[PDB]
Amino acid sequence: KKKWDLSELPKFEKNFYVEHPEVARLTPYEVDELRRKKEITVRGGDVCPKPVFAFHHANFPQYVMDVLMDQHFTEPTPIQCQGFPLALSGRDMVGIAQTGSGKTLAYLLPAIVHINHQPYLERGDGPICLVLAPTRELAQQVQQVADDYGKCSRLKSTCIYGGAPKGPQIRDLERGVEICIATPGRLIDFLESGKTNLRRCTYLVLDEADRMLDMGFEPQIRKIVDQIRPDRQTLMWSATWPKEVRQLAEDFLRDYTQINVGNLELHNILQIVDVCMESEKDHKLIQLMEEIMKTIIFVETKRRCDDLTRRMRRDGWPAMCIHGDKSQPERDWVLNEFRSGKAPILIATDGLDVEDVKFVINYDYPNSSEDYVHRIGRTARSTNKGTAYTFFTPGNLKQARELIKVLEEANQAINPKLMQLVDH
């Protein structure tokens, strides 16, 4: 169905999470410390339940708990600690974690509970849980885990992938499976021939979405997901968080929360360069803060640092500067005024970080690309919708080449007037 009326589809539930009292009694500070010591980050802004820190906090059925304790795990992984409550609460979610973090259990055990709260499969029914994987190897791993944890509940799962004979896969699909772990191409083949359907799938998992996009599976993935009811529960997992994965998540998920495990690495702010001439900067710059509805300006000098600060304070702007020649009491005081909000405009020639960043203005482009990219990194490592402005002027060609290389590696939208400089 390309368009849906969900009131005609069978009803189903998603929220089965019963929070454990040992987790409920955690104060906000204790929850924050627990997330920090496990390197767990929640975007914004988002509505996310408290993380668990023991398997029995999840209140799993005793067969899953039996196999889990038979694995002799000392503790759940951080991605599990934060994804078990999210998934068991029926929330669509995005998980930014590397491989080996334990995401498989994190999306598979809630899938088992989700299926257990549903009626049995009738003849011809498709799978209830669909896990899309980029490679055959990952699909086989996930299927092995799913059979390890679903055999006691008598759940039937299958692995669908190309390069293998179609006979056993068709037989598994026609005899009925509640969990299907598929690669896109073979699954599309089976769907078009009617060997399986998605009318029953209420639990969608997109494993390694970044790899799936990088290998050219986006049209196939979209064709598959278009046939699944939109009121489903969707869990996307990726090792990176670039523009393509963000767009895929906004397209496939509804009211989702994004969580990160490990350090941020690479993060996405609207890096915009404008090519001007020198004496046309100030105008634009004043423009660049007459739209302020918070702001860090970078220059080359300490001389013109103080000069620009004094000139914009002459014009009436609440700007304050910081550099190496200033004392440390003055530095701490200026930073306090910046964080509290009196002086929302900081001007600097540079570890030390501030959290609330709405605009970054490299008033004069640094002489490197490394001096440029780490400013954006320090800014985007915080949670923001910031926009980094830079004032470039067409004097240097190699400089523009390096800047364009950085912008292309950042998946940014280079304005045509900067590409026009090395076009010919």
Q: Residue 223 Cβ, how far from Mg ion at the closest point, in Å?
A: 16
The residue whose two tokens read 């009491």 is 329
Q: Which stretch binds Mg ion (CB under 5 A): 167-175, 181-189, 288-296, 402-410?
A: 181-189
Which residue, 20 or 136, is less far from Mg ion as judged by CB? 136
Query: Known binder of ligand: residue 104?
Result: yes
Q: Residue 163 Cβ, how far from Mg ion at the closest point, in Å?
A: 6
Query: Known binder of ligand: residue 98?
Result: yes
Choose among 90, 103, 105: nearest CA to 16: 90
Choose among 363, 304, 93, 279: nearest CA to 203: 93
Q: Residue 5 Cβ, how far from Mg ion at the closest point, in Å?
A: 35
Which residue, 162 or 262, is less far from Mg ion as judged by CB? 162
Q: Which stretch binds Mg ion (CB under 5 A): 66-74, 87-95, 117-125, 179-187?
A: 179-187
Residue type, 177: V
Q: Residue 185 Cβ, how far from Mg ion at the closest point, in Å?
A: 6
Residue 189 sits in the site that holds Mg ion (CB under 5 A): no
Q: Residue 133 Cβ, how far from Mg ion at the closest point, in Å?
A: 9
Residue 90 sits in the site that holds Mg ion (CB under 5 A): no
Task: Give the helix/strand (H/E) hosting 66.
Answer: helix 62-70
Looking at residues 130 to 159 of the shown chain, list those that interact with Mg ion (rule: CB under 5 A): 136
Q: Which stretch binds Mg ion (CB under 5 A): 69-77, 117-125, 129-137, 412-420?
A: 129-137
Q: What values do phi and psi take at 191, rounded to 5?
A: -70, -45
Which residue, 127 or 134, is less far from Mg ion as judged by CB? 134
Residue 262 sits in the site that holds Mg ion (CB under 5 A): no
Which residue, 149 or 161, is less far from Mg ion as judged by CB? 161
Return the number of other C-beta atoms located less than 10 Å from residue 240's C-beta: 16
Query: Known binder of ligand: residue 103?
Result: yes
Return the number of other C-beta atoms located less than 10 Å from residue 207's C-beta: 25
Residue nearest to Mg ion (CB): 162
Residue 188 sits in the site that holds Mg ion (CB under 5 A): no
For the residues of 178-220, what is the DSSP string, one character each?
SEEEE-HHHHHHHHHTTS---TT--EEEETTHHHHHHTT-HHH
Looking at residues 229 to 258 of the shown chain, list those that interact with Mg ion (rule: CB under 5 A): none
Choose among 187, 154, 17, 183: nearest CA to 87: 17
Q: Residue 162 Cβ, how far from Mg ion at the closest point, in Å?
A: 4
What's the rounded Cα separation, in Å, for the pair 367 and 390?
13
Which residue, 82 or 183, is less far from Mg ion as judged by CB? 183
Query: Known binder of ligand: residue 3?
Result: no
Burial of 267 (0-12, 13-18, 19+ CB in 10 A): middle
Choose among 101, 100, 83: nearest CA to 92: 83
Which residue, 145 or 188, is less far from Mg ion as judged by CB? 188
Query: Known binder of ligand: residue 390?
Result: no
Q: Residue 192 Cβ, how far from Mg ion at the closest point, in Å?
A: 17
Instruction: Read off the tokens for 4.
Output: 């849906």
Residue 318 sits in the site that holds Mg ion (CB under 5 A): no
Cα angle, residue 82 at apex, residues 235 and 118 outer, rounded to 5°: 50
Bond preceding residue 45 cis, omega within 30 of 0: yes
Residue 183 sits in the site that holds Mg ion (CB under 5 A): yes
Which residue, 183 or 379, is less far from Mg ion as judged by CB? 183
Q: Residue 54 Cβ, how far from Mg ion at the closest point, in Å?
A: 38
Query: Known binder of ligand: residue 101?
Result: yes
Give me the helices (H) in 298-369, please: 303-314, 328-340
Residue 162 sits in the site that holds Mg ion (CB under 5 A): yes
What's the rounded Cα separation, in Å, for the pair 76 and 20?
15
Instruction: Give the residue numbers of the binding site.
Output: 97-104
Residues of this chain that bind Mg ion (CB under 5 A): 136, 161-162, 183
Instruction: Give the residue numbers of the binding site for ATP.
Output: 97-104
